Amino acid sequence: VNYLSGLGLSRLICLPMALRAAIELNVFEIIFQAGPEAQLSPAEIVAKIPTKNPNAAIALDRILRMLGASSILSVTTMKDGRVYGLTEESRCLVADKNGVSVVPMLLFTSDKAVVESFYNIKDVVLEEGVIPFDRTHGMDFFAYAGKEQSVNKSFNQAMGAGSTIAFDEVFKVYKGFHDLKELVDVGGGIGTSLSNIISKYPHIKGINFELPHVIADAPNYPGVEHIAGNMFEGVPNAQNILLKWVLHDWDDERSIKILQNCWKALPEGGTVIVVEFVLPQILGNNAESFNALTPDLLMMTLNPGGKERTTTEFDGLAKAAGFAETKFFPISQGLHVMEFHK
Amino acid sequence: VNYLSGLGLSRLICLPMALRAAIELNVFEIIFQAGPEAQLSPAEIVAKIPTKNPNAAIALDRILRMLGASSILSVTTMKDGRVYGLTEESRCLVADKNGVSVVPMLLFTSDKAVVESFYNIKDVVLEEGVIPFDRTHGMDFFAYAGKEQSVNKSFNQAMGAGSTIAFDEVFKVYKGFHDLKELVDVGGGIGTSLSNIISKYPHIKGINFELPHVIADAPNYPGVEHIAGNMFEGVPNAQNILLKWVLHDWDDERSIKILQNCWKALPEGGTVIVVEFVLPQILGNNAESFNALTPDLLMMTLNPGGKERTTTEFDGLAKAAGFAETKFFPISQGLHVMEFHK
Numbered sequence: 161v162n163y164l165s166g167l168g169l170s171r172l173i174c175l176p177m178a179l180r181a182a183i184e185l186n187v188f189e190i191i192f193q194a195g196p197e198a199q200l201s202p203a204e205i206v207a208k209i210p211t212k213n214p215n216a217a218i219a220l221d222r223i224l225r226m227l228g229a230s231s232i233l234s235v236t237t238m239k240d241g242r243v244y245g246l247t248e249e250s251r252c253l254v255a256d257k258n259g260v261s262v263v264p265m266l267l268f269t270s271d272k273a274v275v276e277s278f279y280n281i282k283d284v285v286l287e288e289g290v291i292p293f294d295r296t297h298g299m300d301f302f303a304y305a306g307k308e309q310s311v312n313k314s315f316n317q318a319m320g321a322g323s324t325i326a327f328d329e330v331f332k333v334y335k336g337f338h339d340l341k342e343l344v345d346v347g348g349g350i351g352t353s354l355s356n357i358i359s360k361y362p363h364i365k366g367i368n369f370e371l372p373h374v375i376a377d378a379p380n381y382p383g384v385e386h387i388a389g390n391m392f393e394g395v396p397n398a399q400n401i402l403l404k405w406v407l408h409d410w411d412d413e414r415s416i417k418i419l420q421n422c423w424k425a426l427p428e429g430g431t432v433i434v435v436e437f438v439l440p441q442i443l444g445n446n447a448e449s450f451n452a453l454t455p456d457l458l459m460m461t462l463n464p465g466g467k468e469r470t471t472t473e474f475d476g477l478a479k480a481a482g483f484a485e486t487k488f489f490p491i492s493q494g495l496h497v498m499e500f501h502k
Numbered sequence: 503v504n505y506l507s508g509l510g511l512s513r514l515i516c517l518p519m520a521l522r523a524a525i526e527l528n529v530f531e532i533i534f535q536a537g538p539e540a541q542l543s544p545a546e547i548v549a550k551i552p553t554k555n556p557n558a559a560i561a562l563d564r565i566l567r568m569l570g571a572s573s574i575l576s577v578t579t580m581k582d583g584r585v586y587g588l589t590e591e592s593r594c595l596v597a598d599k600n601g602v603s604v605v606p607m608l609l610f611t612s613d614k615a616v617v618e619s620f621y622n623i624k625d626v627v628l629e630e631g632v633i634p635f636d637r638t639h640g641m642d643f644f645a646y647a648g649k650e651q652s653v654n655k656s657f658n659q660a661m662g663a664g665s666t667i668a669f670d671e672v673f674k675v676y677k678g679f680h681d682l683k684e685l686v687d688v689g690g691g692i693g694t695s696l697s698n699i700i701s702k703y704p705h706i707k708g709i710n711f712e713l714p715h716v717i718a719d720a721p722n723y724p725g726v727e728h729i730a731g732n733m734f735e736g737v738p739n740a741q742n743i744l745l746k747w748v749l750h751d752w753d754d755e756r757s758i759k760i761l762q763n764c765w766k767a768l769p770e771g772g773t774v775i776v777v778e779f780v781l782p783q784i785l786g787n788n789a790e791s792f793n794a795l796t797p798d799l800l801m802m803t804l805n806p807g808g809k810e811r812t813t814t815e816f817d818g819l820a821k822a823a824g825f826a827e828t829k830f831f832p833i834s835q836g837l838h839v840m841e842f843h844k
């Protein structure tokens with residue numbers, strides 16, 4: 161064996177940090193403004209970065225060439241040096257006409273508090289009942305967000321941006337919100353999901369049900385009523401309930417408790433609309449696989465037994481909580497809408 | 503644009519932390535012990551891990567399947583679930599007959615002190631004269647190693663393991679050490695490089711020239727003599743000098759100063775033997791490219807202007823410091839031995 165071949169595995173820790181830097185330096189917007197297909201030199205990019213550092217372009221090229229070699233940026237090698245463009249992935253770091261991109265999510269998932277917890281992810285293998293975040297920070301993630309405003313904001317903005325992205329794709333495929341008149345969003349974040357839904361379907365009365373520290377941070381979105389509560393104690397009586405990126409935070413026992421409380425709050429013809437990525441039974445080097453494995457490891461490090469689930473497992477949760485039927489609506493690259501029918 | 507495609511970029515931070523966990527859980531050795539071609543289930547691997555956690559195998563599978571999807575482990579899905587085997591890269595995580603692997607390097611380069619500094623790598627673009635590590639920790643990396651023994655040890659072991667790996671490959675191709683009688687290793691770490699050399703060439707007297715805190719951490723390698731000092735003030739009189747993984751720690755100004763002090767310490771016809779990875783002039787999809795870019799970003803975050811260099815740049819350093827001639831000896835996947843002749 162030639163062990164030199166292994167030293168390059170250190171690239172894996174370099175790459176997320178290079179990406180974080182490029183995000184914070186506004187690289188992706190700068191490239192995009194030259195044209196979605198544009199490729200720019202380091203000097204052309206630095207022209208739009210506020211810096212008086214004469215070495216800025218050389219330094220930036222060191223970051224960008226690692227991203228390009230790793231296929232996070234497109235690259236063309238010219239006689240005068242490299243030029244850099246966007247990929248299908250990194251184009252998503254550019255704000256849309258509404259100011260929305262994946263940037264808030266990517267900055268949250270490499271935030272210091274998250275990364276510090278990741279050093280203890282092996283403890284979930286070694287020790288029963290240990291949550292890496294709780295061990296690293298002394299309390300559970302949601303309590304910590306309630307105590308630390310900068311994490312509350314980083315997290316709430318990450319979820320909000322992800323919500324607009326998710327619902328922009330949901331509405332291309334799934335029409336089920338059209339027939340609803342009222343929707344309680346259990347664990348609905350700062351209300352962005354409901355604002356998206358009510359923007360598309362303005363006849364819907366939307367109730368965001370959340371922890372006090374989240375509703376305190378929430379914008380006064382038109383049509384959205386914010387109510388504080390604890391979903392483990394109960395949820396408001398509701399014609400229909402939305403549960404997005406909530407069940408994957410919790411182990412099966414807590415997920416069933418949430419769903420039972422939803423069952424209790426719903427009428428006979430009521431539905432829980434679940435929005436999650438779905439873990440494929442067959443994992444590979446593809447987007448549906450990584451779109452589940454990525455949040456799965458974030459759940460493993462951050463949350464109380466949280467995990468991503470297969471279709472079979474979601475159906476099992478629904479049935480264990482009293483729902484008679486599950487309907488699955490694949491949206492895009494693993495994201496699903498699921499209806500739990502009572 | 504489907505912005506869901508950008509969310510998966512969070513994989514970049516998950517993957518190195520999964521790898522670190524698998525290393526700390528000894529997964530690669532456990533697989534190897536079953537047969538260099540074995541594929542083991544998470545339950546079979548947990549059989550060899552000290553844990554009382556009945557969830558251990560489920561938890562371990564969550565880490566390993568991310569490594570498998572990323573081609574760091576082979577993965578096959580069978581009737582009882584996934585089984586995992588080694589790759590060419592991950593085989594380098596298994597110790598050889600001498601106890602050597604890349605593990606010490608991979609644990610050092612994802613150590614908390616390093617990753618903390620990486621949060622400030624964008625400052626090298628934005629501000630002249632800023633070193634991310636110094637900004638994060640209040641002093642330069644080598645001084646910090648003198649103050650924090652856990653980093654001193656992790657770093658010294660990483661460099662030692664890398665040294666044995668490097669010289670195992672050097673000695674297959676480069677015969678220039680055979681003709682030497684005296685060799686001062688300037689910045690020679692804990693002496694592993696000299697131990698390799700003087701073991702292979704027992705006529706050579708090896709003198710390691712290092713900072714006191716490194717020498718204090720060194721093993722009792724037979725035949726290796728340590729001298730403490732500061733190479734910027736001068737280096738010991740020497741018939742020949744070794745400089746391995748030193749020049750890439752420093753900007754051109756400080757590299758030239760080191761090489762000038764070497765020139766002063768050498769006789770006519772004395773040689774500086776430089777061992778470094780070499781940055782290809784045109785980057786491509788090859789091992790030498792990634793093997794230079796990875797340490798280049800580590801230099802950017804850790805060291806005082808350190809950077810990887812092309813052949814042209816190394817020749818320029820040699821000539822600027824008074825050397826008449828450079829000879830280049832490619833070893834393997836970008837690693838070179840270079841002779842600077844006076």
Ligand SMILES: Nc1ncnc2c1ncn2[C@@H]1O[C@H](CSCC[C@H](N)C(=O)O)[C@@H](O)[C@H]1O
Nearest residue numbers: 319323347348349370371389390391404405
């Ligand atoms: N006990 C509880 N009761 C109500 N909400 C809770 C809760 N514990 C956690 N949560 C909320 O669950 C949310 C999970 S993150 C998902 C937020 C939003 N549904 C979205 O998809 O973007 C957080 O906003 C958190 O505040």
Ligand SMILES: Nc1ncnc2c1ncn2[C@@H]1O[C@H](CSCC[C@H](N)C(=O)O)[C@@H](O)[C@H]1O
Nearest residue numbers: 661665689690691712713731732733746747
């Ligand atoms: N001023 C100085 N004088 C002497 N050695 C120094 C020094 N500043 C840094 N060093 C040393 O330079 C080394 C760079 S790391 C490379 C170590 C070794 N040559 C190897 O290849 O494995 C460290 O071990 C550090 O202690």
Ligand SMILES: COc1cc2c(cc1O)[C@@H]1Cc3ccc(OC)c(O)c3CN1CC2
Nearest residue numbers: 301405409450451454455458462509510512
């Ligand atoms: C495909 O890529 C991604 C997918 C997903 C997430 C992040 C990704 O990068 C985030 C990460 C995350 C982290 C913590 C949470 O609660 C504390 C949480 O609900 C989520 C939600 N999920 C939704 C799925």
Ligand SMILES: COc1cc2c(cc1O)[C@@H]1Cc3ccc(OC)c(O)c3CN1CC2
Nearest residue numbers: 167168170607643747751793796797800804
């Ligand atoms: C191909 O992959 C790698 C190549 C190399 C290194 C690590 C890698 O993963 C290490 C990293 C490193 C970090 C800090 C140093 O001084 C503070 C230092 O000398 C080195 C040496 N280099 C040698 C080249």
